[PDB]
Structures are given as C-alpha cells and as structure tokens.
Structure 1
Amino acid sequence: GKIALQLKATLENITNLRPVGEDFRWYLKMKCGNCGEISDKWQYIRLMDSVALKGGRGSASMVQKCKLCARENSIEILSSTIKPYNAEDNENFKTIVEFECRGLEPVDFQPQAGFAAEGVESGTAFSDINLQEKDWTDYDEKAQESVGIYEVTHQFVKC
C-alpha cells in the first residue's frame, strides 16, 4: 500500500518549498495494520537509511517488529514522489511525498527542519527552514520584502 502526505500552508512571497537532502527527517507516528498499535514516540525516517527487504521486494527506509503483535512491518519514502509546495498551491492540500507501506501506515506528521524555499520573484534561496512551530518568517533583501509560511497543516490520503 501507498499513502500520500499532503501539506497546506499560507504562503507570503514564497515558492518551491520542499524537503531537501538524503538526511531530511520525516517525523511520523505509525500504526500497525495488524493490531492497531500506535507507538507513543515520534519516529523519524530518512532516505539515507535503506534496508534490503526479502524476496524481490526491494528496499525500505525503516523495518520494525511491532511491539504488541510482533509482525515485521516496514515503510519506504519514495524519492521520486517528493514534490515542492509552490505559490500556486497556496492554501490547498498538495501531496509532497508518498510512502510505500508494508503493514505500517503513517498516521501523524511533525514537520521540523531541512526544508528549503525561494523568494517568488527574487529567486533568493532560503535554506534549512524549520516548520516545527507551523509558522516561519524571514526577509528577502533582494526583493525588499518579507517572506513567510503560515498555518502549516497536513493530512494523509490513500494513493
């Protein structure tokens, strides 16, 4: 099964907002599809981490044994599905990544740092944006204007 993570935010003079880097941390809460167990802990997964699965199943970002029912579950970030959140997406949900899930679905998301974006006309780069507080403000010197990302929210959808 594939699950899409959709972001929404209110944008100020900003576009091309996206996760960057192999070490980018997707902080998630995950639910075992066998027994309904949801760990209390935020757990992060990264592209950088990559474990072989058995059969011709390829790879996963994380494999774990559910603590309640003991099933081996896995999740894989699909690198090719990572998409930017752009000025035209303002205030709409948009899929920014997809996960290949084998027995374990993400049910919550805590964005933190490692995002990047760009001034919409200036093209000035804003690197390592931390969205943990769901609101972010900076100033674009070239464009002589404020930039911001506000009211960040998310949802998961089947895909």
Structure 2
Amino acid sequence: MGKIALQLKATLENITNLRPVGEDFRWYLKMKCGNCGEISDKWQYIRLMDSVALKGGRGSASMVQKCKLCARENSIEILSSTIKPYNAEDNENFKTIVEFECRGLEPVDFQPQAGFAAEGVESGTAFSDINLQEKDWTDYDEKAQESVGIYEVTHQFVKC
C-alpha cells in the first residue's frame, strides 16, 4: 500500500472554489501495475460511487483490476476526505486536490475532463458542468460583468 497525491496547477481568471463535484466524478488516469510496470494503453477512470468491499479485512477500493500481463489483482481507492478545491489564492501554484491509496495500481498520468464546478471570485456566480479536457475553459459572469477562465491546467504526482 502507498498513498499518492495528485496536485493541480492552473491560471485562474475571476474564478474560485474550482472542484470535482459528486460521487460520480470521473478521475481519468493512466495506471501502472506495481508488479510488472505495465501502463494502461487507454485512459481508465475511477469514481467514488464504484466503491467495493475487499475480502478479508483489507478495506475497500474504487477499482480492482486483474493485470493482463502478470495476473496480479491490483486496486486503488480515492480518499474522499482528501478532495480539496483549487481557489483564487492557489493561482499558478501546484496544490493537492485529491489523494489515492494504491494497492498495486499507481497513476502516472491524469486527464481532467468533465464534472468540475467553480464560482465567480466575488459574485459567487455558479459555473457547473465545467469540462477541462482542453486544459482551458472560458465563460462570462453576467453578475460580475467579467470573463471567467481556467487556463494552462497541468498536474503532478507526489508520493506520500
């Protein structure tokens, strides 16, 4: 078992409280088998709503997968109490937004897609259904009379 933090960085414009929303939120990841090193060929996602009870007091997992190359049964779990928003004050800094407990599947890449939400920095205008798949996003806050944006989204992994 190991924990891994996923840190986001983005440039924010007139936006705050940027966060994944809901138990159905999808963390799209490329995952590495911890025994044979095989990295998934396609993006896979994991979500809190898929939680499954592991046998024999081992706890739970968000995803269990038998490695196709070495037959190990590996798992990974999103830690829900570690999910944090990315705020106006975090602008352009890496910041941990979620942690995963890894039992033989470890993420080595991350693709933010849909399901994020955020709000106008002063207006509190709600923006939902934000898709970051392009790594840029723009909209207009009518209450603020300002453009809002999230640009140059990137990430990195910290082993905890």
Please give the secondary structure, in 2, of the residue aligned with 1:48: helix
Please give the secondary structure, in 1, of the residue aligned with 2:22: coil
> CA shift at 1:54, angstroms?
1.7
> CA shift at 1:105, angstroms?
0.3
Deviates more, 1:8-17 or 1:48-57: 48-57
Q: Superposition RMSD on alpha carbons, in Å?
A: 0.6
Which digits, 9 at most, give the CA deviation of each residue in 1:65-120, with x for residues without a partner? 11111110000001100000000000000000000100110000010000000100
> CA shift at 1:58, angstroms?
1.3
Match of 1:66 in 2: 67
How many Å separate the matches in 1 of 2:140 and 2:75?
41
Moved over 3 A (4+): none
Any residues of structure 2 matched to 1:105-116 within 5 Å, and which?
105-116=106-117
> CA shift at 1:140, angstroms?
0.4
> CA shift at 1:21, angstroms?
0.5
> CA shift at 1:55, angstroms?
2.1
Which digits, 9 at most, give the CA deviation of each residue in 1:45-66, with x for residues without a partner? 0011011112222110000111
TM-score between both structures, scaled by the size of structure 1: 0.99
> CA shift at 1:39, angstroms?
1.4
Percent identity between the two aligned chains: 100
Name stretches of at least 5 consecutive residues in structure 1 with no aligned partner.
Answer: none
Match status 1:34 vs 2:20: no
Which digits, 9 at most, give the CA deviation of each residue in 1:18-54, with x for residues without a partner? 0001100000000011110111010010011011112
Match status 1:48 vs 2:42: no
Name stretches of at least 5 consecutive residues in structure 2 with no aligned partner.
Answer: none
How many Å separate the matches in 2 of 1:114 and 1:94?
19
Number of aligned residue pairs: 159
